[PDB]
Amino acid sequence: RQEGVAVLLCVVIAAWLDVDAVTRVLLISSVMLVMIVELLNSAIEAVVDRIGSEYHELSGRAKDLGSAAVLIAIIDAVITWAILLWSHFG
Amino acid sequence: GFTRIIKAAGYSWKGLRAAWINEAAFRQEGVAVLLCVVIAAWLDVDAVTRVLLISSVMLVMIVELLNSAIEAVVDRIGSEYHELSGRAKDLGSAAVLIAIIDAVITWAILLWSHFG
Amino acid sequence: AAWINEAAFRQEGVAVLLCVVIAAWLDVDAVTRVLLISSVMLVMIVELLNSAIEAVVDRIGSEYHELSGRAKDLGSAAVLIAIIDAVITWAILLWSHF
Ligand SMILES: CCCCCCCC/C=C\CCCCCC(=O)OC[C@H](O)CO
Ligand SMILES: CCCCCCCC/C=C\CCCCCC(=O)OC[C@H](O)CO
Structure with missing residues (x-):
């Protein structure tokens, strides 16, 4: 049940980052x-x-x-984070 | 190719019809979803929002x-x-509960940012 | 992966793949x-x-x-609702793109 750890960490990172509401x-x-x-x-x-x-x-x-x-959803999650973080730090 | 879509569209309509006829909760949810799509369609917001x-x-x-x-x-x-x-x-x-909470929160976050 | 060798998934998969490649090349903002x-x-x-x-x-x-x-x-x-959502998404986003 370590999958919930990954999710919590993401939410913490997302909150920690100074991004707009949409991002x-x-x-x-x-x-x-x-x-x-x-x-x-x-x-x-x-x-x-x-x-x-x-x-x-x-x-x-x-x-x-x-x-x-599940794989497709994972790929989509990684693309999203990559694209958005690249834009935030561009 | 065209025959595969028509058949799948028929199954899809039977599916929406059955879920609708069979349960009040599904009908009320579909009401709630159609109201949100309509409200979102008329809100003065950016396209991504x-x-x-x-x-x-x-x-x-x-x-x-x-x-x-x-x-x-x-x-x-x-x-x-x-x-x-x-x-x-x-x-x-x-x-189902995750998706529903995620929708409520998304709506709360975005409408709060849009209003004040 | 014996399922990816079927005409049904191939036609649906190749459509999704093209849209991702087009999106990758479009001149739009990141969130779009x-x-x-x-x-x-x-x-x-x-x-x-x-x-x-x-x-x-x-x-x-x-x-x-x-x-x-x-x-x-x-x-x-x-599947139908998902397709409608994709068409709606592309419509709203690329209407503005012009
Ligand atoms: C098969 C999977 C892929 C291979 C594994 C990963 C390899 C990462 C190595 C180097 C990073 C190169 C530069 C990355 C950053 C980059 O592309 O920055 C431009 C902006 O993204 C444009 O907006
Ligand atoms: C499956 C193969 C993976 C291969 C490894 C790379 C994966 C990078 C992720 C998405 C590409 C989308 C298009 C990239 C360019 C792109 O989106 O640039 C504008 C951004 O919004 C930044 O401003």
Whole structure:
């Protein structure tokens, strides 16, 4: 459950930085989206494990698609922070 | 290509219709989202601010719908109590509350900055 | 990643990819650029979650159940709202750009 640490740290950094309201909303939203997509991904895999523990083509497919989503949200969070911090310190 | 969109649009309308017919809470939420999109559309704000007010509430809807999809799968498997059944719905509901709080705060921060 | 080799995801993925490349090249401010990019990436995220759910449903069986269709429809509706949000975002932001 160390994932909440990452989120708190981001909010602390965002508050610590001297940025406008819009920038701060984007920095924190992007982190919040990651959290949302991870929880939705964990729900899906909970359902997969509820159906059965044995392997199946569609169970793996479900988990692979869920994980890819989390990855996309993570990439989007990193791009956001990079772009905004580059602009703030430009 | 064109046939794939028409079919998916049909499924999408059945989905909005079912969620709407089935629950008062969903209807009232959809009311709240449409009021926010309208208010954001008429506010004298910059374009980026306008987008954030709209996106934050639309995200509420997206997560609401995705979570209702998972609830339907869990209820599809069985209405009987199960640990992963309860857990799936718990993680799903958390995701909905996060998005809703994030929208409320976003609206509070931006409208406070716009007004005074 | 056997799913990225399908025509459905490829057509949706390549569209999102182009929008991110266009956004990367546009002459706009930073917060505008972040918004253009993250809105089309949200389409991709939701579209992946929707296929995950569809996969779980098909996992259960080929027999039809009302909640099976409902799960798939609600997933499709989520994708639709995400797409609308992306179109709205690009419209509002690039209308001003002119
Ligand atoms: C495959 C992933 C990427 C590779 C791993 C990371 C490598 C980072 C190394 C050097 C930093 C170069 C300069 C970075 C700063 C930079 O680009 O500043 C311009 C402004 O961003 C324009 O606004
Ligand atoms: C996946 C490959 C990663 C490869 C590593 C680099 C990733 C840099 C992040 C975003 C690029 C967006 C476009 C960059 C230029 C850009 O946005 O400049 C204006 C800014 O707003 C600063 O003022």
